[PDB]
Amino acid sequence: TPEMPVLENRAAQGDITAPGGARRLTGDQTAALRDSLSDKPAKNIILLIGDGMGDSEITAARNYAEGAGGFFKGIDALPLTGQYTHYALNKKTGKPDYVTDSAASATAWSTGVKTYNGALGVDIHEKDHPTILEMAKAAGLATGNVSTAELQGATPAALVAHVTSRKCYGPSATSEKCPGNALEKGGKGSITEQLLNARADVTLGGGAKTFAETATAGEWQGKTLREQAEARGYQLVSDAASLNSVTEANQQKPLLGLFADGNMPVRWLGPKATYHGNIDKPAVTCTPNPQRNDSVPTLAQMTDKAIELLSKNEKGFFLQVEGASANPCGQIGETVDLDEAVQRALEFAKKEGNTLVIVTADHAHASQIVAPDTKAPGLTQALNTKDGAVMVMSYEHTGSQLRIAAYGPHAANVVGLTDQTDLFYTMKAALGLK
Amino acid sequence: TPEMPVLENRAAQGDITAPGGARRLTGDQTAALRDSLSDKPAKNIILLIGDGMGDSEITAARNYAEGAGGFFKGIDALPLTGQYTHYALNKKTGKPDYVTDSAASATAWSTGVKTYNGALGVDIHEKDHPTILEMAKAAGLATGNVSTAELQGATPAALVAHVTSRKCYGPSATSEKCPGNALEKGGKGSITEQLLNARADVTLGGGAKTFAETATAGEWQGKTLREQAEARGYQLVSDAASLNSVTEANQQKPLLGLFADGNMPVRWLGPKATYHGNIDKPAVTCTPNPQRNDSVPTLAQMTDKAIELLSKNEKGFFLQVEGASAANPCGQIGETVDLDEAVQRALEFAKKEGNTLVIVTADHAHASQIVAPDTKAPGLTQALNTKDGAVMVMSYEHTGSQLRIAAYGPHAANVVGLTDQTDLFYTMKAALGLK
């Protein structure tokens, strides 16, 4: 039965200077697309999120790494595409707030309810709403959360924590900034304490710093959150070797991989963009970061490991993978990173035939690709792309709708204009979560 | 009984502060989407181009005019959506120039070949290439060209002119800037002269000022290009009353409507954005432009008259419609609202007819960004009171980002995913069965 093609090749087909040369299509999509459509139940969902990765950021990364007529074998290979909205709510008025932050957006797709800038897992009345991971887990499904940023960061945090502020990282900052959530005040705990209670089968990322914090109440008081994790049965892993030896990870043995104190390392380094840096400075070539290491797993590696462990669950799985860390090279390199994770996800999804893979961003950032002769009011940098031509980028969250792309069962629900909260109901209905 | 659906409503379905209230979907989309897939031939194509309307401009205009949970009934209603690239090429090297201008992007979807910035209907070796309008016309189809900007502007002109510089509006300018296209030098003429030769069945837009120039050579030397068009059998209309009087337009009697000397008047008036304008000035509400007129045909009126006159052709039609007419948030949003009225008209037609492909996209993305109210940005900003009674701040060039392309109809499936601007030429070719 015609089981779902991925976009094969959408690179410029020939000589870009010639008629028909820059075409990305070799024919008519109608029947490929017809076979891309299935409404049958998604057994697994993999959701890949690029921090700030709107259309402008995908274009600049393609231009740099693949060349303008190039194609990301992961990000651009998803057959169903649409645009979605992500406005937040002003807390006092409940009126729309056109420019969201990462917390409210992360909340909108994990719980399906709009909230205010700064909130995680709570609506504007500070009430908690259940996340898609809490719900997958309640249904007996394996669950995993992966990031290259701090695990306390808004996108990973929003699946496991419910606090009135994204800053309530650990006990210290919670007593002070989220009193109603402070464990001492009967609240549910900080983002890191709620993480530990939440017991996702696979959690992997940065942010080991706040795990050194110590509990102020509860049966693990005085112990640090790392000690509590181990005390609760988590198998901790802190490099690529240990992650690779892990054979099983489940509710009896939750894997928790902490690979960086803050954010895990950035793939490429470059100079900072400067005022008139395109006029007054050379075109940049990005340097691979020497200090990324064979000890530190990559986002693609974490993704593949997580898929390996989570797929042993005979009921299905949910997995969120976040690709996060005026530095254009570091920006572009993280989109390359994520593309490799999407690729792996698609590799699994095609083979399995019952996985919805979704790639999108939390919200748009402010860089634009601009004409190389520009006198911007800002920070620019000219870059040497794959094409041997220079691209100037110019430099903060923005409110623009952005791309969401999908492959697999129920992916039709991302085509057209949707809203970020619809993603929760799409995933929930795909997974049959009742 | 099959009919292909348009998205009747993807507004937030309820209370946006409550669970499920901000959903734009009320259920599963699969079945509606397969009912939207058809490879059958398209009899007609209506292509609407939003001048600079990338995803930021669509969102900014929806928030202001419809509210954040709102829905543009034309623009957001097209069920098959994708993203397309639109880079130009460097003329000297043939290497990509990541940020196109209007001329080079207009050449790419009308001719299918990439080119350099400033070029109309010629490739980087200055070779002319048939535009999709010339080929539809060559095949016996009715063709139309409507704009709110000057007819000599990059987007309407790319359909009918082949010149080495977009600035080659009329005799004067072609002689000095495009001397290899100057009519008194054996070239094909200015944009206006080639427009007159291309003899599309309906051409409606602004730009009457250059028709006041006199030709330098040829059969109509010394006559103005307006006297020429009359002498060549064109029916000229210059206001809404006479436009609605036209009964037919075809090759014997072709319609040319010149409603303004330069661009047609802007829908909404508002101040220009300003440095620290979102903190130093109150929020703006856009007001109707007094000069927009009763006498001046709106873009949905022109689109509607064009479809009427063009559907008299037993064989089908091709129609391109351009919404265009200075860091002014209200003119900018007014024109997206304009174009959305035009898209609803095209879509009522297409939905009724059953064999029309409607594509709505932009030539290239512009640079306005929706920012946070309290932003201290280095450009020009302005705060605006939206339909929600909330403030939206806008910040201010062309940019290189890929942008939205959306479609409805037979062959509309070929806009989904990542395509390139020149793929649009081929999707039109193939839909329409050309060549």
Swiss-Prot record, chain B:
Location (main, coarse): periplasm
Catalytic residues (UniProt): S102
Cystine connections: C168-C178, C286-C330
SMART domains listed in its UniProt record: alkPPc (SM00098)
Sorted UniProt keywords: Disulfide bond, Hydrolase, Magnesium, Metal-binding, Periplasm, Phosphoprotein, Signal, Zinc
Cofactor note: Binds 1 Mg(2+) ion. Binds 2 Zn(2+) ions.
Binding site for Mg(2+): D51, G153, T155, E322
Chain sites annotated for binding Zn(2+) 1: H398
EC number: 3.1.3.1
Cofactor(s) the record lists: Mg(2+); Zn(2+)
Subcellular location: Periplasm
Superkingdom, taxonomy of origin: Bacteria
Catalytic activity: a phosphate monoester + H2O = an alcohol + phosphate
One of the GO biological process terms: protein dephosphorylation
CDD domains named in the record: ALP (cd16012)
Gene Ontology MF, one: phosphoprotein phosphatase activity
Amino acids binding Zn(2+) 2: D51, D363, H364
Keyword Ligase in record: no
Family classification: Belongs to the alkaline phosphatase family.
Subunit and partners: Isozymes 1 and 3 are a dimer of identical chains, isozyme 2 is a dimer of heterogeneous chains, one of each of the subunits from isozymes 1 and 3.
Protein name according to UniProt: Alkaline phosphatase
